[PDB]
Write a protein that binds this ligand. Structure first.
Ligand SMILES: CC(=O)N[C@@H]1[C@@H](O)[C@H](O[C@@H]2O[C@H](CO)[C@@H](O[C@H]3O[C@H](CO)[C@@H](O[C@@H]4O[C@H](CO)[C@@H](O[C@@H]5O[C@H](CO)[C@@H](O[C@@H]6O[C@H](CO)[C@@H](O)[C@H](O)[C@H]6NC(C)=O)[C@H](O)[C@H]5NC(C)=O)[C@H](O)[C@H]4NC(C)=O)[C@H](O)[C@H]3NC(C)=O)[C@H](O)[C@H]2NC(C)=O)[C@@H](CO)O[C@@H]1O
Ligand SMILES: *[C@@H]1O[C@H](CO)[C@@H](O[C@H]2O[C@H](CO)[C@@H](O)[C@H](O)[C@H]2NC(C)=O)[C@H](O)[C@H]1NC(C)=O
Length: 361
């Protein structure tokens, strides 16, 4: 089983304990660590933060302690403009240019592969995304002839029924990608004025219409479209999405007035790190959707959909039972990486819980 873990560039800037650098990562925790996010300039892959070359270096030195550890660099990301990816891929010349620039870049900075986080391709992009993946893999196959270990190529894909149908030719890209990470966590949001869990495992017989917004549907659907389970990796959240209630109502369907107040460390409305949640819980009322098998908490006019050790182990058993290649955790720097926020002195509680179940039979 594979355990793919994402580490974000911008987390180094968070004040106090929220501050997190590559060296805080347990070299034996994950099988694959992915640095997010590289950038694209003059149609070439490039750094993003000013000190990336330094952090790249710090991250890849983890491989000195754990020789089996693999690292990848991800291009794209939610804030990277999709149109940008789009213009690059639609033109053979600009696409070949971006492709030819990757290997050298990775080799120099000691990465073992590239991760395409094109988010998200439109109806007019499906064909070119297939092209990008095919040609990028062909380049990696070629570059290996020089004697070095072949580079890995993965991709982060939406778990949204409509998003999948719209811009991905799953059957095609699966045969060229080493593993596909299913983003099975932003199923609900705060774009909709109602309370809901973003990463439910199962549907939940109550109030429906969605039926497609849960991990079990996404996995099954992907398997149906032609993706081998031995290449599918399921995404497990390490952050929660918050809401500001519009009424004293707390149960399913409750009215929402907008995102949640920012966390002291992550400073972003609508998002909370697991370590901020651990502090949030004190004095909060905790609940759990039995059908969906996930928890949520409420304090004041604040409502939080999150994942705890239990929900996470539960999702881990799930992918094992369906025989998937493994789990994908977003992100190591939102987990209790210091292990001084969530009680039981343990570094990376959530990611660890995943690792134990996978380590099990
Ligand atoms: C919210 C929503 O609806 N969107 C979701 C998507 O998130 C979701 O995408 C997938 O799943 C992940 C979680 O859902 C997703 O989220 C993450 O993506 C974006 C980036 O793509 C992250 O954006 C952060 O936002 C930060 C603000 O909160 C921002 O911080 C600023 O960062 C800059 C540098 O990075 C700092 O500047 C530096 O400042 C110092 C001094 O302070 C200087 O010394 C430096 O020189 C400065 N200069 C620079 C530019 O380097 C700055 O201090 C800092 N401060 C501020 C103003 O707050 C980050 O820059 C930015 N990151 C980027 C690259 O833009 C989100 O926060 C992430 N969300 C969470 C939660 O983690 C991923 O994109 C995606 N994952 C995968 C697998 O790809 C999708 C479903 O896919 O659904 C929705 O769209
Ligand atoms: C990532 O690369 C992009 C593309 O090269 C950079 O985008 C900008 O580049 C110029 C310098 O800021 C701007 O004048 C361009 O208008 C703008 N390009 C586009 C299409 O928006 C960007 O600077 C890089 N990002 C970081 C964080 O370094």
């Amino acid at each position: 089983y594979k355990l793919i873990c994402y580490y974000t560039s911008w987390s180094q800037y968070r004040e106090g304990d929220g501050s997190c650098f590559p060296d805080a990562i347990d070299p034996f925790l994950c099988t694959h660590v992915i640095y997010s996010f590289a950038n694209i300039s003059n149609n070439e892959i490039d750094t993003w933060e000013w000190n990336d070359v330094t952090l790249y270096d710090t991250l890849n030195t983890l491989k000195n302690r754990n020789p089996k550890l693999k690292t990848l660099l991800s291009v794209g990301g939610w804030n990277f403009g999709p149109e940008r990816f789009s213009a690059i891929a639609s033109k053979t010349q600009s696409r070949r240019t971006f492709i030819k620039s990757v290997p050298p870049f990775l080799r120099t900075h000691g990465f073992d592969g590239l991760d395409l986080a094109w988010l998200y391709p439109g109806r007019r992009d499906k064909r070119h995304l297939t092209t990008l993946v095919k040609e990028m893999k062909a380049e990696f196959i070629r570059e290996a002839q020089a004697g070095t270990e072949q580079l890995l190529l993965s991709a982060a894909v939406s778990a949204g029924k409509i998003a999948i149908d719209r811009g991905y030719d799953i059957a095609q890209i699966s045969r060229h990608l080493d593993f596909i990470s299913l983003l099975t966590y932003d199923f609900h949001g705060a774009w909709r004025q109602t309370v809901g869990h973003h990463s439910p495992l199962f549907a939940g017989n109550e109030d429906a219409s969605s039926r497609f917004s849960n991990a079990d549907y996404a996995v099954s659907y992907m398997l149906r479209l032609g993706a081998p389970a031995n290449k599918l990796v399921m995404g497990i959240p390490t952050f929660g999405r918050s809401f500001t209630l519009a009424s004293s109502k707390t149960d399913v369907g409750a009215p929402v007035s907008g995102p949640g107040v920012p966390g002291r460390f992550t400073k972003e409305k609508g998002i909370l790190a697991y370590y901020e949640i651990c502090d949030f819980l004190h004095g909060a009322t905790t609940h759990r959707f039995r059908d969906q098998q996930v928890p949520y908490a409420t304090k004041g006019n604040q409502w939080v959909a999150y994942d705890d050790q239990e929900s996470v182990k539960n999702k881990a058993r799930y992918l094992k039972n369906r025989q998937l290649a493994g789990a994908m955790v977003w992100a190591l720097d939102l987990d209790d990486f210091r292990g001084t926020f969530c009680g039981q002195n343990l570094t990376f509680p959530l990611t660890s819980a995943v690792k134990d179940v996978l380590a099990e039979v």
